[PDB]
């Protein structure tokens, strides 16, 4: 299976206090493995997964230095962007940065990406060729000019095709007991009557990893979208994920509906019916 590594960076500007907050998390696939907070006392990148703890001083040292540099770049650009939008100096504003790289089971580099946002809207993106940018506003056009005239995509593509994949391969070997495992969904189905003639059938998937899963309700073997309810795949805090889907069915017909479950850890899709 393919495996990714993505880093997430939030900077929000705090006018009253006067020095913005900076939160950075690192995920391998769906398993966060590091973190950095600007108001926390530690002021260093902190392991959040056991298999990265083995890396020594130099790794943590270099990572903290680079992330602090990113924090200061974000602060300055928050200042520049409040100008590009002619915005109040009173208000608080967010800059978000996500970037990462995807390698396949062969281990070979598959793709790279780097997207930047302001105030929850797309600001600028690295295009799929890693040498063109797609700005989303006129202010972004200003940024592209400076970036295009600085050949920043070169540095982003050197990192994305370079250190990013090498290190994700190192991490995937360091934690292969947990990063390449596939805990299959544990499924079960509940029955809650709602009227004398209506009942709800709810279909449960628990304890699965990775977080990708597909729950489907089919009435008489045809996919049912009306009278369905599916909830957002949620974490458990043990490193697995949970999901349920549900349908309101008439009375006496509970056996004309079927829950279909697709996930990696199931080699053939599973079917569930109220017995």
């Amino acid at each position: 299976g393919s495996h990714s590594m993505r880093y997430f960076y939030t900077s929000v500007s705090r006018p009253g206090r006067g020095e913005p907050r900076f939160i950075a998390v690192g995920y391998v696939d769906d398993t966060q493995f590091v973190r950095f907070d600007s108001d926390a006392a530690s002021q260093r990148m902190e392991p959040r997964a056991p298999w990265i703890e083995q890396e020594g001083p130099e790794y943590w040292d270099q990572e903290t230095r680079n992330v602090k540099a990113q924090s200061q770049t974000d602060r300055v650009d928050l200042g520049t962007l409040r100008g590009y939008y002619n915005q109040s100096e009173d208000g608080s504003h967010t800059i978000q940065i996500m970037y990462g790289c995807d390698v396949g089971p062969d281990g070979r580099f598959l793709r790279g990406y780097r997207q930047d946002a302001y105030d929850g809207k797309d600001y600028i993106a690295l295009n799929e060729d890693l040498r063109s940018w797609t700005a989303a506003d006129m202010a972004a056009q200003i940024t592209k000019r400076k970036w295009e005239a600085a050949h920043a995509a070169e540095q982003q593509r050197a990192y994305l095709e370079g250190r990013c994949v090498e290190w994700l391969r190192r991490y995937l070997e360091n934690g292969k007991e947990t990063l390449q495992r596939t805990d299959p969904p544990k499924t079960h189905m509940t029955h809650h009557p709602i009227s004398d003639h209506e009942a709800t059938l709810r279909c449960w998937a628990l304890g699965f990893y990775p977080a990708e899963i597909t729950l489907t309700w089919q009435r008489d073997g045809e996919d049912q979208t009306q009278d369905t309810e599916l909830v957002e795949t949620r974490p458990a805090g043990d490193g697995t994920f949970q999901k349920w889907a549900a349908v309101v069915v008439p009375s006496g017909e509970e056996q004309r509906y079927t829950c279909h479950v697709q996930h990696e850890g199931l080699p053939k899709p599973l079917t569930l019916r109220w017995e």
Partner: peptide, 10 residues
Amino acid sequence: VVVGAAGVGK
């Protein structure tokens, strides 16, 4: 790891 030195201004 994280992206290395950049200093890329917006």
